[PDB]
T-cell receptor
Framework: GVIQTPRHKVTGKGQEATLWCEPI?????VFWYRQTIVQGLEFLTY????????DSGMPKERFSAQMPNQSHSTLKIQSTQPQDSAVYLC???????????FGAGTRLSVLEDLKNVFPPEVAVFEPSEAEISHTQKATLVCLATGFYPDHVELSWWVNGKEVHSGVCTDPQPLKEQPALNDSRYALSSRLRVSATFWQNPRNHFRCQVQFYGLSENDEWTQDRAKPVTQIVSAEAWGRAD | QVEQLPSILRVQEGSSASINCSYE??????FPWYKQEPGENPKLIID?????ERKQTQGLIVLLDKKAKRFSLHITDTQPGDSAMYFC??????????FGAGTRLKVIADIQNPDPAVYQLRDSKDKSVCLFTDFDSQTNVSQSKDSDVYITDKCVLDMRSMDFKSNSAVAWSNKSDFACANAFNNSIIPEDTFF
């Protein structure tokens, strides 16, 4: 269906950001919406065949929407501000159709200072001997710590294939320093397998965290490594005894 | 403009859950409902037109009262996994989809055979993490009253394969004076922590 890029965008205050949406082969296909915790789904703007029809919801400054061709649409924000941070959904609907199809959106995080962006450190912890003995089950745990902002995606890979059944990831990360508003985050996830499965030393477990940060375009003064968008992983092998 | 209630809906597994919406235009003709799983796109789940007053398909019921300008969604026998964000909308003619602000539905799971335990994990070389697991639904992992000790909230897993659900929470610290014995002084179910 509807393809939106990028999936995540981190910018600093005052940077420009443009958001891309490719609708489905259809006419009424702008339905830009903003999605936030406070205001929910908010109509922004609407196009029928490249023609601006309603821009009622668009902020009266800095925000603009265009349709270059009839197979793509853009949302441009000038001079990004923290309040601009949200998920920006794009949607399309056909002619004789009521159904509205949504994109997965672009998550925009506008930070005060890009000097506070850090990527996660990832580590995986092997099941408890006690747990195995008591329940005949083995729970692996993964810890992503010390990352900012909170654009992370955590996945479990068992022998090179990603797995889902028996995964539990925290729905929201925790602030490492919860007093401060601008704090680094941690996330934990659990993978629960049979004790037999863990005991097989040919089984390979990998916890993988996709972090979104700076693009290669962005400048980096500080004497540490620049926190680009990257994958950070940690592995463990099954163990017999 | 469309009002959707409630914003957050905590329902117990097996019980039914209802979301109500109301709209402010006599002209609205189509009322779709969208489910949205974290990270993904809203996906149409069921809809109803001004032609009809109730529809039941796909494990879902919707009502529409045009006179009252209210419509609702009803999910019977909730299971974790109905846990998602839902959204209602009202549309007029060929344009104009006005959406509710959404309902975050949390389905709380019935741990059948709880087995409260607190275990100690290790690896690679802090070093050590503690796992509080298999505790019942009515337990609150509270936050760390020790700074430099971190405790996650509970996490509900549901298997497709078996009819077993489990709760878990993770706690860790770099300190020397830290162990699993006395890490989770929340209102623990009175068992385990056996090493």
């Amino acid at each position: 269906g509807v393809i939106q890029t990028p999936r995540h965008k981190v910018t600093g205050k005052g940077q420009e950001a443009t958001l891309w949406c490719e609708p489905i082969s259809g006419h009424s296909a702008v339905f830009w919406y903003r999605q936030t915790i406070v205001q929910g789904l908010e109509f922004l703007t609407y196009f029928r065949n490249q023609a601006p029809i309603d821009d009622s919801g668009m902020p009266k400054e800095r925000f603009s929407a265009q349709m270059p061709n009839q197979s793509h649409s853009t949302l441009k924000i000038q001079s990004t501000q923290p309040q601009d941070s949200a998920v920006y959904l794009c949607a399309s609907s056909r002619q004789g159709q009521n159904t509205l199809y949504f994109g997965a959106g672009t998550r925009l995080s506008v930070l005060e200072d890009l000097k506070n962006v850090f990527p996660p450190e990832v580590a995986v912890f092997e099941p408890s001997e006690a747990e195995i003995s008591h329940t005949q089950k083995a729970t692996l745990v993964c810890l992503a710590t010390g990352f900012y902002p909170d654009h992370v995606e955590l996945s479990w890979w068992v022998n090179g294939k990603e797995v889902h059944s028996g995964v539990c990831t925290d729905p929201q990360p925790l602030k490492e320093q919860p007093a401060l508003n601008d704090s680094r985050y941690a996330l934990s996830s659990r993978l629960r397998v049979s004790a037999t499965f863990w005991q097989n030393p040919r089984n390979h477990f990998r916890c993988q965290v996709q972090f979104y940060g700076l693009s290669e375009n962005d400048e980096w003064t500080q004497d540490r490594a620049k926190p680009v968008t990257q994958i950070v992983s940690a592995e463990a092998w099954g163990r017999a005894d | 403009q469309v009002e959707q209630l409630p914003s957050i809906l905590r329902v117990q597994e097996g019980s039914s859950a209802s979301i109500n919406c109301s709209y402010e235009d006599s002209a609205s003709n189509y009322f779709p409902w969208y489910k949205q799983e974290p990270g993904e796109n809203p996906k149409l789940i069921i809809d109803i037109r001004s032609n009809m007053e109730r529809k039941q398909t796909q494990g879902l019921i919707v009502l529409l009262d045009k006179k009252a300008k209210r419509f609702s969604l009803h999910i019977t026998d909730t299971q974790p996994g109905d846990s998602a964000m839902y959204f209602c909308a009202a549309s007029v003619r060929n344009y104009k989809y006005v959406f509710g602000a959404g309902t975050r539905l949390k389905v709380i799971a019935d741990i059948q055979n709880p087995d409260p335990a607190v275990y100690q994990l290790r690896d690679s070389k802090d070093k050590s993490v503690c796992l509080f697991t298999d505790f019942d639904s009515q337990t609150n992992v509270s936050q760390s009253k020790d700074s430099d000790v971190y405790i996650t909230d509970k996490c509900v897993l549901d298997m497709r394969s078996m009819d077993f659900k489990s709760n878990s929470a993770v706690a860790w610290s770099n300190k020397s004076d830290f162990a699993c014995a006395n890490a989770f002084n929340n209102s623990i179910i009175p068992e385990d922590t056996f090493f």
